Design a protein around this ligand. Structure first.
Ligand SMILES: O=[N+]([O-])c1ccc(O[C@H]2O[C@H](CO)[C@H](O)[C@H](O)[C@H]2O)cc1
Ligand SMILES: O=[N+]([O-])c1ccc(O[C@H]2O[C@H](CO)[C@H](O)[C@H](O)[C@H]2O)cc1
Ligand SMILES: O=[N+]([O-])c1ccc(O[C@H]2O[C@H](CO)[C@H](O)[C@H](O)[C@H]2O)cc1
Ligand SMILES: O=[N+]([O-])c1ccc(O[C@H]2O[C@H](CO)[C@H](O)[C@H](O)[C@H]2O)cc1
Lengths: 15, 133, 133, 15, 133, 15, 16, 133
């Protein structure tokens, strides 16, 4: 894949 | 709620949110930086109105967020994000909304928040943050 | 307490920690991955002894941590980390310690914990995590 | 500088 | 020439360039991906005209550039980029321009080109590439 | 230490 | 999606 | 030749290589940094002897590599790395070896070389570099 990636933290909130 | 995902950008210039102390966070919109220019992200609106608007206008790129905190809780039988605070290297913004329910907090020692995703119904249901160096 | 900083590695093979059911988390040591080989981290021990040890052996590389949670609160007048819980894509480990005070949690949607830093006195005072893709 | 860096989140706990 | 810097994006959808088989590369424009949507970059245009246009339309996101190569050499007293070639996982685009002078090449084993910067006068004088995971 | 995200940059070639 | 961190890698140069 | 892959580290402290002024680069070994400690990489040895050693001892962390360049070319019928030059923010080291064949170069505008991999038989056959921020 040609889409770059980033860290993601979460989610906070509802399921 | 309606899911949103802004994706990742180069930084944050302004956060427009709204909230109601009786309930929770409503609307959420971000002006990102994209390679030195403002990127006006889509306004993710509560299904309802009646919120107080807040504009967090950052001194980009000198000022950046170093901590995001808040509370989740039950509103009308729904678990939602009730309150948010944004601490930067310059000032603290918030809390916006009542600080009651289960706290959470994301302090950043190194790195930057560069994106938001989540879901908003009547209220902000949940969110996540993209981080980068 | 005594500060520590493991720095960043290429992922996590094992977490060893110790705790007491009435105070808080005591000792902390991580077996990291480095470039596909095990790297045994420094063992960050409490100033005191008497804790219950726990070894969390991950099936690396298919199993990885997706959430770290716990509680902070006061033991003998100090704010310390009272409980930890590690949730991976396979299983939950913990909680270990005393689950009261103020909760915190770091779920990760994309990315990996690759290092820890913090400070331990009689108990774990505070900690931070290195994240990477 | 010649030192690689990484995202760091926290701290949680005292101080 | 006129310096340009697109900055970094999510990926590459299309590269437009122009060249002349007796001089060098002239114009340069990229359609980037930005978080799953096309973002049409600034068109970096030569001071002169009469070049032959080329549109490289990638099958994003499955097709991505794995190698950029080319030649630099002197044209009318100016040392410029005379030729460019783009190798993806699907096929090779080019050479465009004149393949004479001093070669260069950037193969990528892991990672993605996500932006371009450089300078263009009558011809493309030089360029650099933003790389990301 | 600013608010602008950074990324690896290789080059320049040419010149 | 694995527990191994990754890094940009450029090259190789030299033999094919 | 024999493949090697050191992986990624935090930085580079020293490079130990050998070369022959009539052939190509032979041995290659790197002292990395790993979170503030020297990490002695494995010595990657040529299959033959008769090279001249050289020790490139960087003033880490204030000194770092900004450009690796060199030549690939035929020795005894094999394409090998004939020459290497390391330019830092402080000094240039090399060229080591023979400056003939096809030139290559990897200048870095932003980031760091944090690892090498490749293959060595009689001479260095090929190499790649890990890059980070
Ligand atoms: O009549 N209401 O007050 C009310 C409240 C919440 C409702 O649900 C919608 O919003 C929720 C909270 O944000 C959640 O997103 C849910 O999925 C939505 O249907 C509906 C009516
Ligand atoms: O006699 N005490 O129960 C007691 C407990 C803790 C003390 O401090 C040491 O531990 C603290 C919490 O871990 C903190 O690290 C402090 O800095 C240490 O000196 C002292 C006495
Ligand atoms: O009489 N000419 O063929 C000629 C060519 C190029 C000139 O300069 C412009 O292009 C240069 C090479 O790309 C360089 O960018 C320069 O700064 C431009 O003004 C002028 C005359
Ligand atoms: O005739 N020789 O001097 C000679 C040179 C190289 C040979 O092969 C070994 O080295 C090659 C280039 O480094 C390549 O790695 C090959 O796979 C090695 O066996 C044999 C004879």
């Amino acid at each position: 894949s040609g889409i770059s990636q980033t860290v993601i933290v979460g989610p906070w909130g509802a399921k | 709620g309606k899911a949103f995902d802004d994706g990742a950008f180069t930084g944050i210039r302004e956060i427009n949110l709204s909230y109601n102390k009786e309930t929770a966070i409503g609307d959420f919109q971000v002006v990102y930086d994209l390679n030195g220019s403002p990127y006006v992200g889509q306004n993710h609106k509560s299904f309802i109105t009646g919120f107080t608007p807040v504009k967090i206008s950052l001194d980009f790129p000198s000022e950046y967020i170093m901590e995001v905190s808040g509370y989740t809780g039950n509103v009308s039988g729904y678990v939602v994000v009730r309150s948010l605070t944004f601490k930067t290297n310059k000032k603290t913004y918030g809390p916006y909304g009542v600080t009651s329910g289960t706290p959470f907090n994301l302090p950043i020692e190194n790195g930057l928040i560069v994106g938001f995703k989540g879901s908003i119904g009547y209220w902000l249901d949940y969110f996540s943050m993209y981080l980068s160096l």
